[PDB]
Amino acid sequence: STILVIHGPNLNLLGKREPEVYGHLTLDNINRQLIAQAEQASITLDTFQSNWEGAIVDRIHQAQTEGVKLIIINPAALTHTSVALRDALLGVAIPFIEVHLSNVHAREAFRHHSYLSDKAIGVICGLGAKGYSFALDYAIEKIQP
Amino acid sequence: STILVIHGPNLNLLGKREPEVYGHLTLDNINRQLIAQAEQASITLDTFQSNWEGAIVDRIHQAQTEGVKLIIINPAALTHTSVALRDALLGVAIPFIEVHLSNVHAREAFRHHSYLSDKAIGVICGLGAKGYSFALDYAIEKIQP
Amino acid sequence: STILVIHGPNLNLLGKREPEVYGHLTLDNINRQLIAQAEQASITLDTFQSNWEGAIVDRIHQAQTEGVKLIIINPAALTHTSVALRDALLGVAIPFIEVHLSNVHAREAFRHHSYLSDKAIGVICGLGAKGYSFALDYAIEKIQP
Amino acid sequence: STILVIHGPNLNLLGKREPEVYGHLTLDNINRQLIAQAEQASITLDTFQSNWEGAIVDRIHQAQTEGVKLIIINPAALTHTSVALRDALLGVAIPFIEVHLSNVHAREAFRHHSYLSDKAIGVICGLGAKGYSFALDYAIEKIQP
Ligand SMILES: O=C1C[C@@](O)(C(=O)O)C[C@@H](O)[C@@H]1O
Ligand SMILES: O=C1C[C@@](O)(C(=O)O)C[C@@H](O)[C@@H]1O
Ligand SMILES: O=C1C[C@@](O)(C(=O)O)C[C@@H](O)[C@@H]1O
Ligand SMILES: O=C1C[C@@](O)(C(=O)O)C[C@@H](O)[C@@H]1O
Ligand code: NA
Ligand code: NA
Ligand code: NA
Ligand code: NA
């Protein structure tokens, strides 16, 4: 696969978690849309989610070996805490775009700091699931001239 | 005047200052691409660029009187300094999206704080001129099924 | 085990992240040097690396049951984030030396704080693979005066 | 002399208390072991201690003129206070390794900052007088493979 989409802890709860009090679409719905999008552009796209930081790190390591050209990542809570993730992405030297569903700057102060943002191509926050689709459009044109 | 795109100070310089390496597109090129994208969606797109904070504030007050529905703003340097912009946008209560061409997290520490971001629907940084198109796509869709 | 060497996350990448820039020294090379150094002093050494913080915590717990007398630990990114590792090492009451390959004080400011160093016998950083060998040297002489 | 060993203020006291901070050995003894270690490897080593910052700076200047290839420095209290010393080592551009006998990160907060460490090849702390012997072992391999 040429692009890997990674989703961090708790994002498996989307739609499952508090629907109509705080839900509606799901991770599996987001994943299908992105694969379809990338399928329209003749590009293979993988996806991965985990609540375990080591699984994600491991997955990033595997990406180097598969020749993934770009990672689109929603590190979720790990954004704020995990230097291990940062050093995984820099260690494999695969460029990445960071995406958040919610506008992190409108939330608690600890959510305003990222161990990844300075090393990303760019960041999109607050635009919901559409944030991933934008990141993918960007990535497609970065690979195909 | 359904959608207003505002460009802050110095953005008039795009694709001027030595065009050998990296990026060559001008503010004018960005504007035409946005207007053509808005035409396709049947939305009327207004654009404005100034180096003067008060002109930007005045244009935003004018947006309310014109019944603008949403603002896409690249406040450029004013993002870090201007409470007056924040107040104009809240005072007219037009929702906005914030866009930066560059990844501000990779730059000096003063560039990490925004008097706007916490009130924005969301923020796109570091995806170049494509960020404004993404913001527009999201804004279009926010008005229209 | 008498002495246990622990490598934290991402140290599996050594020698594969970009050989012209970074070099060809691998984690296996390190481990072989250490094992031989300890074989020479009539010392048994085990090694462990993982990208998963809980595997490293459980490995530390196991060292207490195996009768390990000292740990040499390169916590990698977990030096900056993991209270759990600190709590493990304290909980089992095995002395440790902390080793970093890179000079951490020359890098980002977050790399300068640690949850471990204040409980270590000592710290070595910046001396590449040889920092481990110096720690093992100190460790061999402590257990066998 | 190809390698110069610098000891900062107070380190002439090393016999007496506080010993529990490493150690019972005296300076003359430390410098006798390092001279021998350097003999067995055919390197010419000098040593220097003073309680006066200007004398250390003078000494580093002369090191330039005498053709010194590497410095091993325990700056003692000067680590936390002397920018003159930093500027001296950088000015004569001789590479250096920083050593402390005690684990500074286990001591008062002011002792955790160094005006030298970011420019050092590396740092050893907390291993007693053996940290000097390590520093010289690395230094010997750096100048003679
Ligand atoms: O879990 C998440 C999700 C998030 O990254 C987002 O997608 O909005 C925002 C993070 O702060 C939070 O920890
Ligand atoms: O002027 C600008 C441009 C900018 O908003 C951008 O578009 O990247 C980023 C701001 O920090 C800077 O002051
Ligand atoms: O992951 C690592 C590796 C490291 O521990 C080293 O061995 O140089 C230093 C840490 O700052 C970093 O987060
Ligand atoms: O004098 C010393 C000795 C020391 O550098 C050491 O060798 O542990 C630690 C310093 O903070 C203290 O000022
Ligand atoms: Na953001
Ligand atoms: Na941003
Ligand atoms: Na250190
Ligand atoms: Na230290």
* D7 among known catalytic residues: no
- Going from N- to C-terminal start, the domains of chain D cover 1-145
First to last CA, chain D: 18
Query: In this structure, what are the phi and psi dihedrals at residue D113, rounded to the nearest 5 degrees?
Result: -105, 145
Beta bridge partners of A96: A71
CA distance A16 to A26: 7
Residue to mutate, A104, A105, A132, A134, ligand 1, most ligand atoms under 8 Å from C-beta: A104
Cα-based distances in Å from D71 to B138, D84, D120, D132: 60, 16, 10, 11
Q: B67 in the Ramachandran plot: left (φ > 0), alpha (ψ -120 to 50) or beta? A: left
CA distance B11 to C17: 38
Produce one character per residue of A103-117: b if its CB has 16 or more CB atoms within 10 Å, e if not: bbbbeeeebbebbbb
B74 carries a ligand binding annotation:
yes
- Cβ contacts (< 8 Å) between C106 and chain D: which residues? 117-119
Q: C76 in the Ramachandran plot: left (φ > 0), alpha (ψ -120 to 50) or beta? A: left
D101 carries a ligand binding annotation:
yes
Query: In this structure, what are the phi and psi dihedrals at residue A55, rounded to the nearest 5 degrees?
Result: -60, -35
CA distance A42 to B96: 34
CA distance B7 to B72: 9
Query: DSSP assignment, residue B12?
Result: G
Produce one character per residue of C18-38: b if its CB has 16 or more CB atoms within 10 Å, e if not: eeeeeeeebbeebbebbbebb
**D79: its two tokens:** 């680590």
Beta bridge partners of C114: none
Instruction: Provide residues of A within 8 Å CB-CB of chain C.
Output: 52-55, 57-58, 61, 64, 81-84, 86-88, 91-93, 115
From the list A119, A127, A134, A15, the residue with the least C-alpha distance to A60 is A119
Is A16 strand, coil or helix?
A: coil
Task: Check: CB of residue C26 under 8 Å from CB of residue C15.
Answer: yes
**What is the pairing mode between strands D122-125 and C122-125?**
antiparallel
Cα-only R_g, chain A: 14
Query: DSSP assignment, residue D27?
Result: H
From the list A42, A72, A51, the residue with the least C-alpha distance to A60 is A72
DSSP-assigned letters across all residues of D39-99: HHTT--EEEEE-S-HHHHHHHHHHHHHHT--EEEEE-GGGGGT-HHHHHHHHHTT--EEEE
**C134: its two tokens:** 């110096």
* A132 among known catalytic residues: no
Closest atom of ligand 4 to CA, residue D103: 8
Substitution target in C33, C79, C113, C138 with the highest count of D β-carbons within 10 Å is C138
Closest atom of ligand 3 to CA, residue C75: 5
Task: Check: CB of residue C25 under 8 Å from CB of residue C15.
Answer: yes
Asked if D125 and C121 come within 8 Å (Cβ–Cβ), the reply is no
Query: Which residue's alpha carbon is at the smallest distance from atom 10 of ligand 1?
Result: A76
CA distance D59 to D74: 14
Query: DSSP assignment, residue D19?
Result: G
Of D118, D126, D137, the CB nearest to C123: D126
- Cβ contacts (< 8 Å) between B117 and chain A: which residues? 103, 105-106
CA distance C12 to D42: 37
From the list B9, B2, B3, the residue with the least C-alpha distance to B79 is B9
Strand arrangement, sheet containing D70-74:
C45-49, C3-7, C70-74, C96-100, C122-125, D122-125, D96-100, D70-74, D3-7, D45-49
Asked if D138 and C119 come within 8 Å (Cβ–Cβ), the reply is no
Task: Check: CB of residue C18 under 8 Å from CB of residue C61.
Answer: no
What's A111-131 look like in SS3? HHCCCCHHHCCCEEECCCCHH
One-letter identity of residue C13? L
List the chains bordering chain A where 3 or more Cβ pairs fall under 8 Å: B, C
The CB-based long-range contact list for B26-32 (8 Å cut-off, 24+ gap) reads B29/B129, B30/B129, B30/B132, B31/B5
Is D31 strand, coil or helix?
A: helix
Check the CA dihedral D20-D22-D27-D28 and report its sign.
Answer: positive
Task: Check: CB of residue B5 under 8 Å from CB of residue B48.
Answer: yes
Beta bridge partners of C3: C45, C70
CA distance D132 to D41: 15
Is B74 strand, coil or helix?
A: strand
- Cβ contacts (< 8 Å) between C111 and chain A: which residues? 83
CA distance A87 to B32: 40
Is D21 strand, coil or helix?
A: helix
Cα-based distances in Å from A110 to A105, A106, A132, C115: 9, 11, 23, 19
Work out the minimum CA distance from A131 to partner chain B, whole angstroms: 9
B111 carries a ligand binding annotation:
yes
CA distance D32 to D38: 10
- DSSP percent split of chain A into helix, strand, coil, nearest 5: 50, 15, 35
Q: Resolution of the coordinates in A?
A: 1.8
CA distance A8 to A121: 19
Within 10 angstroms of residue A32's Cβ, the number of other Cβ atoms is 12
Question: Which protein residues have a CB closer than 5 Å to ligand 6 (ion)?
Answer: A 123; B 123, 125
From the list C21, C50, C25, C47, the residue with the least C-alpha distance to C35 is C47
Of A120, A122, A126, the CB nearest to B122: A126
**CB within 8 A of B2, min separation 6: which ones?**
B38, B43, B44, B45, B68, B69, B70, B143
The CB-based long-range contact list for C55-60 (8 Å cut-off, 24+ gap) reads C55/A54, C56/C6, C56/C8, C56/C85, C56/C88, C57/C84, C57/C85, C57/C88, C59/C4, C59/C6, C60/C6, C60/C85, C60/C88, C60/C89, C60/C92, C60/C94
Residue where the block lists tokens 């396709």: B40
Work out the minimum CA distance from C35 to partner chain D, whole angstroms: 19
List the chains bordering chain C where 3 or more Cβ pairs fall under 8 Å: A, D
The CATH number of the domain covering residues in A1-145: 3.40.50.9100
Produce one character per residue of D46-58: b if its CB has 16 or more CB atoms within 10 Å, e if not: bbbbbeebeebbe
Q: What is the largest CA-CA distance in chain A?
A: 44
Is A40 strand, coil or helix?
A: helix
Work out the minimum CA distance from B99 to partner chain A, whole angstroms: 9
Which H/E stretch holds residue D7? Answer: strand D3-7
Which H/E stretch holds residue A59? Answer: helix A53-65
CA distance A25 to A18: 11
From the list B30, B18, B7, the residue with the least C-alpha distance to B130 is B30
